Every structure is written in C-alpha cells, then in structure tokens.
Amino acid sequence: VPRGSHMKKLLVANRGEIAVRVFRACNELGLSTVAVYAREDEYSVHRFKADESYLIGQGKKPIDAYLDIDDIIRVALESGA
Amino acid sequence: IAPAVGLSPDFRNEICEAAVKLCKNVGYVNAGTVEFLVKDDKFYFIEVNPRVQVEHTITELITGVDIVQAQILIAQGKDLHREIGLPAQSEIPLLGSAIQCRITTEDPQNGFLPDTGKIDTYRSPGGFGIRLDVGNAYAGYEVTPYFDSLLVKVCTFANEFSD
Amino acid sequence: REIGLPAQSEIPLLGSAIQCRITTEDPQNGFLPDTGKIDTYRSPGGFGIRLDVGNAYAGYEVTPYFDSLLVKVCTFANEFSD
Structure with a gap:
C-alpha cells in the first residue's frame, strides 16, 4: 500500500458523463470533489456538479486543454486534492 | 449487453477465468477489462483496457457491485473482501440482464454527423x-x-432479457 | 407458469431500497404545499x-x-448504509 493513500478530496481529470459518474461515487464515499474544464466546455454539467472547479488549458484548443498534464496537476496541488 | 445471454454459462465462465488468469499473472490493480473475440466456442485475447469503461454500468446492474466506488476504495489501499465487502468469486451475484445505449446527436440521416445547437x-x-x-x-x-x-447513456435492466 | 415468478422460497431478496417523495411542502411554513411555476x-x-x-x-x-x-426518488444498493 503506497504512503499517502488516505483521501479527503479527489479531482477528475476528465469531463462529461464520466466525470459526473465519479463525483457521484466520491460524494457517496464522503469525499469532496474537484472538476477541471476547458473554456469552451464552461457550461458542462460536470463543472457544476463538483464541490469546486477550475479552468484549465487557457489559450489552448479545447481537446488539448484536457490533455494538459501539468495544468491538471497544478490544479490538483492548488486545490489540495 | 450483460451478461452475454447468447452464450452458454459454461463457456462464459471459461472466458471469465482466462481473464482472471491473465490479471493474476501480472498482479493487476484496480478496474480493468479484458477483451476477447469469440468464434464457434473458441476465444482469442485482443486487448486489456487498464481503466473503467463507458459500459461499466451494465455490469454494476447485474452484479450489484458499484465499480467506481470500488476503484476509489482500491486506490485507498482497501481489501476487496474485508473492507470493500465483495464476496468470493463464486458468490458474485448475477441478477438478470442489462442493456446500454448511448444517445448522441449523431444524425443517422446525415451519415451520423453530430448535430450541434441549442437543446x-x-x-x-x-x-x-x-x-x-x-x-x-x-x-x-x-x-x-x-x-x-x-x-445521455441509457441502461435498462430486468430479470429476463426480453423484458 | 405464465408471469414467470418463482416459488415463494426462491423470491429474490437483493440488498435494500429507500423511497422518498419530494413534494412542494414547505417545511418552514408548516408543510403547506407551495404553488407556482417551476x-x-x-x-x-x-x-x-x-x-x-x-x-x-x-x-x-x-x-x-x-x-x-x-418526484419519487428511490435508491437501492447491497448494503443499507450505501
């Protein structure tokens, strides 16, 4: 078992139905949640289902925003996920 | 659909055991799916998807197992049986059948090009x-x-496939 | 024979389930039902x-x-706590 496996907060590095599916599971497990969203996806339901959410991939095309490894990690660390 | 209702329970069990064999061999951790092609009572490995899938939903319905909660508890270091509470293999429920369709904006009368616009x-x-x-x-x-x-993904489930 | 239900002892008992009815009764106004446009x-x-x-x-x-x-909401799972 890796060190640091205890969890209070989880971030989904995704969008759409699968992100909402994960948030639901998190909430039922007493975990708080974090969404990321591209600018063009700002009305996505998953953005509003999380306890907090953050824009990512500023100035990139929308698919590249969701593939932006370092910006996703940045959000995870900043939010305390 | 789930289970594979057009194949015999024995043959299905064989396919499931082969998947388990592969995963045991490599010490697989968390959720994953093993994919086979099947032709006249033989089966052939094609792929592992080392992640949850879009169709996990129908497996949840026919087993009673919440796969995504299981992934998260697994990552927290929990034991499938003692803490997550899953039974032993032979006790894993098999409750009727389930079907999933994805409803999309693909227009079948326009070469399945996805429509855009306001709902x-x-x-x-x-x-x-x-x-x-x-x-x-x-x-x-x-x-x-x-x-x-x-x-939206729609799933239906019932005791009988036809229902 | 036709409806296809099993014998009594074979009637499944699969986990548990809970139902709540969501209504317009305002708990802060003596549960008087609210009206108006949704x-x-x-x-x-x-x-x-x-x-x-x-x-x-x-x-x-x-x-x-x-x-x-x-709307009537039901939840269901293997364990009551879930």
Missing part, C-alpha cells in the same frame, strides 16, 4: 429498470462541435 | 437511483388542486 426540450424517462447517466443535455444547453456527441 | 428541474441519475416523476418539468405550474408530489 430546447429535454425530458428524461424513468421508472423500474431504467438507469440514466447523463452527459451534457439539459434544456438550454448548446451542444458545441468541440467534444463527443453523447447526450 | 423554473428549473434537473433530475439526478446514476447507479442505484430510480425516479418516478409526477408533475415536475421546467415550465410546469403547480396548482393548488392536487397533491404536492413532484
């Missing part, structure tokens, strides 16, 4: 044996061209 | 959720003439 009306059904896992579909939502065309 | 109605789903909707959709006017039910 004026979205009324989703429910009742017994219906599960919905919604994407981006609500009244007023503008479907953009940037992402996939999924509106 | 602006927004977004219903959840996922694993272990069943919805049996009454009259609740965006634009529906809840009248004072009938019962206050909007």
Whole structure:
C-alpha cells in the first residue's frame, strides 16, 4: 500500500458523463470533489456538479486543454486534492 | 449487453477465468477489462483496457457491485473482501440482464454527423429498470462541435432479457 | 407458469431500497404545499437511483388542486448504509 493513500478530496481529470459518474461515487464515499474544464466546455454539467472547479488549458484548443498534464496537476496541488 | 445471454454459462465462465488468469499473472490493480473475440466456442485475447469503461454500468446492474466506488476504495489501499465487502468469486451475484445505449446527436440521416445547437426540450424517462447517466443535455444547453456527441447513456435492466 | 415468478422460497431478496417523495411542502411554513411555476428541474441519475416523476418539468405550474408530489426518488444498493 503506497504512503499517502488516505483521501479527503479527489479531482477528475476528465469531463462529461464520466466525470459526473465519479463525483457521484466520491460524494457517496464522503469525499469532496474537484472538476477541471476547458473554456469552451464552461457550461458542462460536470463543472457544476463538483464541490469546486477550475479552468484549465487557457489559450489552448479545447481537446488539448484536457490533455494538459501539468495544468491538471497544478490544479490538483492548488486545490489540495 | 450483460451478461452475454447468447452464450452458454459454461463457456462464459471459461472466458471469465482466462481473464482472471491473465490479471493474476501480472498482479493487476484496480478496474480493468479484458477483451476477447469469440468464434464457434473458441476465444482469442485482443486487448486489456487498464481503466473503467463507458459500459461499466451494465455490469454494476447485474452484479450489484458499484465499480467506481470500488476503484476509489482500491486506490485507498482497501481489501476487496474485508473492507470493500465483495464476496468470493463464486458468490458474485448475477441478477438478470442489462442493456446500454448511448444517445448522441449523431444524425443517422446525415451519415451520423453530430448535430450541434441549442437543446430546447429535454425530458428524461424513468421508472423500474431504467438507469440514466447523463452527459451534457439539459434544456438550454448548446451542444458545441468541440467534444463527443453523447447526450445521455441509457441502461435498462430486468430479470429476463426480453423484458 | 405464465408471469414467470418463482416459488415463494426462491423470491429474490437483493440488498435494500429507500423511497422518498419530494413534494412542494414547505417545511418552514408548516408543510403547506407551495404553488407556482417551476423554473428549473434537473433530475439526478446514476447507479442505484430510480425516479418516478409526477408533475415536475421546467415550465410546469403547480396548482393548488392536487397533491404536492413532484418526484419519487428511490435508491437501492447491497448494503443499507450505501
């Protein structure tokens, strides 16, 4: 078992139905949640289902925003996920 | 669909054991799916998807097991049986059958090109044996061209496949 | 023979389930049913959720003439706590 496996907060590095599916599971497990969203996806339901959410991939095309490894990690660390 | 209702329970068990054999061999951790092609009572490995899948939903319905909660508890270091509470293999439920369809904006009369535009009306059904896992579909939502065309995943489940 | 139900001892007993009725009864106003137009109605789903909707959709006017039910929610899972 890796060190640091205890969890209070989880971030989904995704969008759409699968992100909402994960948030639901998190909430039922007493975990708080974090969404990321591209600018063009700002009305996505998953953005509003999380306890907090953050824009990512500023100035990139929308698919590249969701593939932006370092910006996703940045959000995870900043939010305390 | 789940289970593979057109194949015999024995042959299905064989396929399931082969998947377990591979995963035991490599010490697989968390959720994954092993994919086979099947032809006249032989089966051939094609792929492992080392992640949850879009169709996990129907497996949840026929087993009673919440796969995504299981993934998260597994990552927390928990034991499938002692803490997550899953039974031993031979006790894993098999409760009727389930079907999943993805409803998308692909227009079948226009070569399945995904439509875009504002959703004026979205009324989703429910009742017994219906599960919905919604994407981006609500009244007023503008479907953009940037992402996939999924509106909502629908699953049905019942004791009998025909129901 | 026709409906296909098993014998009594073979009637399944699969986990547990809970039902709540979501109504327009205002708990801060002595549970008097509210009336008026529904602006927004977004219903959840996922694993272990069943919805049996009454009259609740965006634009529906809840009248004072009938019962206050909007939607029946059921949840179900292997364990009661889940």
